[PDB]
Amino acid sequence: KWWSAVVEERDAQSWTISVTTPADAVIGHYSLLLQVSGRKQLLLGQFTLLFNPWNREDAVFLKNEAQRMEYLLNQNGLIYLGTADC
Amino acid sequence: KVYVELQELVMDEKNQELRWMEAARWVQLEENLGENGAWGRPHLSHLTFWSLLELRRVFTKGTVLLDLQETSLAGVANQLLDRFIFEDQIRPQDREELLRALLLKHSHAGELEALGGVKPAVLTRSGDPSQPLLPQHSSLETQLFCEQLEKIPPDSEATLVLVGRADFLEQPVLGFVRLQEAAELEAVELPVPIRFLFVLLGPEAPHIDYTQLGRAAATLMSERVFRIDAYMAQSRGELLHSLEGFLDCSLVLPPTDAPSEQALLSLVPVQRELLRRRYQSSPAKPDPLQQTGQLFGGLVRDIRRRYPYYLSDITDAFSPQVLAAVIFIYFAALSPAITFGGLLGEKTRNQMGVSELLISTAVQGILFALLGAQPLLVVGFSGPLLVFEEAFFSFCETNGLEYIVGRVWIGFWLILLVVLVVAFEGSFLVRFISRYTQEIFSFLISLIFIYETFSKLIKIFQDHPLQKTYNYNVLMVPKPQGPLPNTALLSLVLMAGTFFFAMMLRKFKNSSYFPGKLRRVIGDFGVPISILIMVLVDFFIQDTYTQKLSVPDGFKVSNSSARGWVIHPLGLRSEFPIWMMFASALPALLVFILIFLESQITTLIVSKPERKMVKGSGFHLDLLLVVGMGGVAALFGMPWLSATTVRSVTHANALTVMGKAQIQEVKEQRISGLLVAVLVGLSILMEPILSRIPLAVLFGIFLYMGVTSLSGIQLFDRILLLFKPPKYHPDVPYVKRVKTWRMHLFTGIQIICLAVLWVVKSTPASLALPFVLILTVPLRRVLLPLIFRNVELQCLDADDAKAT
Numbered sequence: 001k002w003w004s005a006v007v008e009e010r011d012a013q014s015w016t017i018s019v020t021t022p023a024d025a026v027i028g029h030y031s032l033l034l035q036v037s038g039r040k041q042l043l044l045g046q047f048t049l050l051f052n053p054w055n056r057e058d059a060v061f062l063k064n065e066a067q068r069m070e071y072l073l074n075q076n077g078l079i080y081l082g083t084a085d086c
Numbered sequence: 087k088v089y090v091e092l093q094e095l096v097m098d099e100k101n102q103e104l105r106w107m108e109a110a111r112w113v114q115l116e117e118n119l120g121e122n123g124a125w126g127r128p129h130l131s132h133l134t135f136w137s138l139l140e141l142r143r144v145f146t147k148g149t150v151l152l153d154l155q156e157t158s159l160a161g162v163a164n165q166l167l168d169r170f171i172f173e174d175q176i177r178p179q180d181r182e183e184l185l186r187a188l189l190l191k192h193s194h195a196g197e198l199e200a201l202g203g204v205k206p207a208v209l210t211r212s213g214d215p216s217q218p219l220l221p222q223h224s225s226l227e228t229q230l231f232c233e234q235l236e237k238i239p240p241d242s243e244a245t246l247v248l249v250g251r252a253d254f255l256e257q258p259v260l261g262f263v264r265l266q267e268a269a270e271l272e273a274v275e276l277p278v279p280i281r282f283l284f285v286l287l288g289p290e291a292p293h294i295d296y297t298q299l300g301r302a303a304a305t306l307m308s309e310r311v312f313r314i315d316a317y318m319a320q321s322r323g324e325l326l327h328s329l330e331g332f333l334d335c336s337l338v339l340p341p342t343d344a345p346s347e348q349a350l351l352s353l354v355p356v357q358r359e360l361l362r363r364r365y366q367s368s369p370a371k372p373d374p375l376q377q378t379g380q381l382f383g384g385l386v387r388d389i390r391r392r393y394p395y396y397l398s399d400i401t402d403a404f405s406p407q408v409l410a411a412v413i414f415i416y417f418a419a420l421s422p423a424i425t426f427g428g429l430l431g432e433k434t435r436n437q438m439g440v441s442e443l444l445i446s447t448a449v450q451g452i453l454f455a456l457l458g459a460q461p462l463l464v465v466g467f468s469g470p471l472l473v474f475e476e477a478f479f480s481f482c483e484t485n486g487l488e489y490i491v492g493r494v495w496i497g498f499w500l501i502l503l504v505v506l507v508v509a510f511e512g513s514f515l516v517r518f519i520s521r522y523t524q525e526i527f528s529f530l531i532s533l534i535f536i537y538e539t540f541s542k543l544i545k546i547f548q549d550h551p552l553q554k555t556y557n558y559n560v561l562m563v564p565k566p567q568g569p570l571p572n573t574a575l576l577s578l579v580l581m582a583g584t585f586f587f588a589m590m591l592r593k594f595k596n597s598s599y600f601p602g603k604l605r606r607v608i609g610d611f612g613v614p615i616s617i618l619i620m621v622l623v624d625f626f627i628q629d630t631y632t633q634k635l636s637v638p639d640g641f642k643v644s645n646s647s648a649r650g651w652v653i654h655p656l657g658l659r660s661e662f663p664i665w666m667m668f669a670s671a672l673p674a675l676l677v678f679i680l681i682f683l684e685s686q687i688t689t690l691i692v693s694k695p696e697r698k699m700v701k702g703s704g705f706h707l708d709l710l711l712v713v714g715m716g717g718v719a720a721l722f723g724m725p726w727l728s729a730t731t732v733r734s735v736t737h738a739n740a741l742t743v744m745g746k747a748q749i750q751e752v753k754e755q756r757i758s759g760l761l762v763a764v765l766v767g768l769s770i771l772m773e774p775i776l777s778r779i780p781l782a783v784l785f786g787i788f789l790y791m792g793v794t795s796l797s798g799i800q801l802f803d804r805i806l807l808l809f810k811p812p813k814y815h816p817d818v819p820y821v822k823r824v825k826t827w828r829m830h831l832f833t834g835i836q837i838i839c840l841a842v843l844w845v846v847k848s849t850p851a852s853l854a855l856p857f858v859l860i861l862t863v864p865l866r867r868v869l870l871p872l873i874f875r876n877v878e879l880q881c882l883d884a885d886d887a888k889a890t
């Protein structure tokens with residue numbers, strides 16, 4: 001439920017790592033770095049963290065999947081103009 | 087070949103009068119006229135892409151007057167403009183002003199300076215020229231070739247290319263004229279008749295530079311295939327067909343951000359094939375350690391490699407850095423000379439002494455600077471040579487043998503040995519001495535130098551111990567006969583002070599303080615400045631005694647009753663035995679191995695590729711010079727010398743110019759070593775100056791040279807990496823491509839070798855050090871691959887510091 005990482009699959013040459021972030025994490029651009037003992041920091045890469053309407057513990061949690069696609073994923077919107085009777 | 091002249095319509099500076107001025111000329115190769123009034127360097131013609139694109143466009147709709155019966159520029163221009171109008175290329179209202187422009191005065195290079203120069207002009211409907219409106223671009227040919235006629239054959243015919251800009255024109259126009267008979271015109275001053283006339287008029291337009299247009303037309307006329315086609319063309323299409331083949335065989339070179347010679351020479355097959363295609367239709371046809379297997383081949387190649395640089399070897403020394411290096415290496419070669427000469431005189435009963443060593447060092451250094459292929463080496467006496475001198479003296483005194491005559495015969499054998507070695511190119515065995523042996527030897531020699539300097543300071547302390555009470559009335563001749571107050575402590579203070587000042591000025595050279603050039607200067611003279619400061623410091627303390635430099639009284643033999651300047655090989659007082667004349671070869675053998683190893687390893691260290699020496703180093707000439715000079719000096723009762731490592735490394739370092747951490751260049755010249763040798767020879771007459779220089783200042787200088795000579799040794803760097811954590815380790819191939827423990831095992835094996843050599847040097851059998859050092863070559867070449875991979879050895883033992 002916080003920042004964490006676990007190796008899920010591993011061969012002799014690579015680790016498949018599952019990384020979690022907290023449900024109340026600060027959003028924005030992130031840098032991921034790896035510290036090996038006896039070694040200096042190494043930048044693994046960059047990722048962007050966003051609010052999560054799909055997560056129950058998030059403050060923006062939306063109960064409905066249809067509501068989630070409509071109110072977050074749909075880029076084709078409708079703005080209603082005119083008058084009340086037209 | 088034919089003459090092609092390009093003239094451009096320009097306006098002058100004094101009367102603002104438009105006229106024609108020649109901008110370039112062609113006799114196959116193209117010459118351009120600069121603004122100064124002189125012709126630039128002739129060059130192969132290169133064309134812009136836009137000039138050829140526009141030349142093809144105007145030529146396609148161009149005006150051709152072939153076999154035209156005119157013999158004057160007025161007659162040609164009248165007919166050319168008459169068919170211009172007939173071809174609807176210019177309007178009849180334009181004929182009057184265009185004819186006025188063509189039959190103008192054609193100036194040449196003889197009146198550029200007489201006039202006020204020329205500026206580009208555009209013809210207007212009014213007579214006065216218009217200032218060009220498009221952005222001006224200065225000619226690339228003028229900037230590159232100009233900012234600094236007998237080749238015309240008698241039967242050759244000329245071509246005139248005229249380019250001009252007129253604002254009152256719809257589109258650029260090309261007029262091509264081939265006269266029926268080659269005639270002389272007032273436009274060309276040269277006495278060559280004109281056959282062809284190119285006229286390129288038009289308005290200012292984008293992507294059209296009329297100077298480049300004229301250059302393209304003149305280059306096309308200068309081409310042999312097109313010119314033959316031009317002579318035999320009876321229609322415009324035949325000229326057009328020849329132009330298409332010219333463009334078909336042209337090579338366009340696109341811009342690149344990383345130009346190189348090798349990538350450019352990858353187009354040699356393309357250029358050859360294009361030239362072959364062009365002429366396939368025309369009737370014309372297109373017009374230092376290697377072994378050579380030859381006696382004295384290495385010596386001759388060594389001479390030919392370096393002797394052409396002799397003029398630079400004198401002029402490159404005209405810098406204050408060279409003078410500072412002279413002042414440095416003078417002391418650095420004089421103090422060991424005095425010390426070793428005193429030891430030689432003490433051991434050999436003054437048969438060979440200080441004066442002999444001084445004169446031998448001077449003469450041999452002068453000759454080596456004048457004739458050596460690597461003049462950065464310092465030639466002087468060394469420790470192993472002293473050990474050989476004592477061993478040979480003991481042997482000669484054991485069997486009742488004269489020592490100096492045995493030295494004469496050893497040198498006589500040395501001459502034969504070095505002649506045989508050079509005649510068989512034996513110096514190519516040096517290539518088997520890799521970075522392993524070189525760095526081991528350099529590190530050992532620097533450590534020995536530092537240890538001996540500290541031992542001299544320690545001996546000063548033992549001679550003058552710190553005690554509560556001293557005898558004050560002690561005799562002061564010729565040296566302290568007892569302990570003296572304040573002597574050892576002042577020696578320590580002087581040594582520490584001169585070392586500290588030298589290191590501070592070395593850091594000041596690389597610092598960011600003061601004007602940089604002044605800091606670079608001050609830093610170059612850092613060792614002389616420190617020497618002067620501490621010499622003054624000891625000068626102003628008069629009561630305390632410090633041991634000073636002592637030179638021989640004069641240029642006399644060190645022992646008048648034993649020998650003269652010249653030694654008789656048959657004996658001085660007793661007849662020299664016959665058997666020793668042949669048995670001198672074995673000690674001569676040992677001396678040859680000692681001198682060969684020391685000198686060639688020093689040459690390898692000094693002339694490394696990472697040291698940025700471009701003048702070359704000769705491994706055959708220098709060995710021959712050093713050993714032959716030693717063999718000759720043996721006949722005069724003088725020591726044979728060798729290219730010492732510490733002195734030569736210091737000499738090369740004092741001539742190295744640093745970049746903005748990275749080696750930039752080295753002042754490789756013959757004057758610095760020559761001046762050091764001359765000063766060493768003159769040191770006898772400089773007694774009032776040298777007698778005020780204490781030995782403690784020179785000891786601090788020696789410590790500085792010892793700690794400085796470790797800069798370029800990877801063994802020292804890896805030993806430091808032993809005390810340094812891996813994460814800190816630098817980005818070098820032997821760190822990034824070799825495991826840390828493997829690198830440290832490599833360093834530990836080198837350390838074991840260093841300990842073995844130090845132990846060997848500590849025993850009386852210290853003359854076997856060259857052979858044990860040689861044994862490190864079979865180590866690296868056989869036993870090291872048995873525990874290290876080829877990758878690890880390439881990364882660790884790299885000749886030029888490469889990542890395999």
Ligand SMILES: CCCCCCCC(=O)OC[C@H](COP(=O)(O)O[C@@H]1[C@H](O)[C@H](O)[C@@H](OP(=O)(O)O)[C@H](OP(=O)(O)O)[C@H]1O)OC(=O)CCCCCCC
Nearest residue numbers: 594595596597598599600601602603604605606608745746
């Ligand atoms: C000894 C001078 C006495 C001071 C007299 C007072 C007058 C005085 O010396 O200052 C003005 C003058 C300014 O002139 P300016 O800035 O043009 O001179 C720069 C200076 O020579 C640097 O050392 C150079 O860098 P580098 O090292 O060659 O890489 C740099 O060249 P570049 O490489 O950047 O292109 C030069 O441009 O000098 C100073 O730089 C300030 C240091 C004051 C020096 C004070 C030292 C006590």
Ligand SMILES: CCCCCCCCCCCC(=O)OC[C@H](COP(=O)(O)OCC[N+](C)(C)C)OC(=O)CCCCCCCCCCC
Nearest residue numbers: 543544545546547548549550551552574578581582585789
């Ligand atoms: C960077 C510049 C160099 C820095 C290193 C300093 C080394 C100085 C030499 C000390 C060793 C030495 O020489 O001591 C040895 C001497 C001699 O002993 P002895 O019994 O007379 O000798 C016996 C031989 N006989 C029988 C021929 C006489 O001991 C002394 O007199 C003791 C006093 C030592 C003073 C040390 C000065 C302070 C050093 C610390 C500074 C940080």
Ligand SMILES: CC(C)CCC[C@@H](C)[C@H]1CC[C@H]2[C@@H]3CC=C4C[C@@H](O)CC[C@]4(C)[C@H]3CC[C@]12C
Nearest residue numbers: 495496497498499500501502503664667668670
């Ligand atoms: C390589 C150099 C050292 C030459 C090798 C030395 C041998 C081969 C030669 C060189 C000069 C020779 C000497 C020249 C002259 C004489 C005088 C004669 O009445 C007795 C023999 C004697 C003394 C010779 C002995 C052999 C000798 C010593």
Ligand SMILES: *[C@@H]1O[C@H](CO)[C@@H](O)[C@H](O)[C@H]1NC(C)=O
Nearest residue numbers: 431435436437645646647648
């Ligand atoms: C010079 O040589 C002589 C005799 O060969 C010897 O007696 C004398 O001690 C030597 N001089 C010196 C200073 O050793």
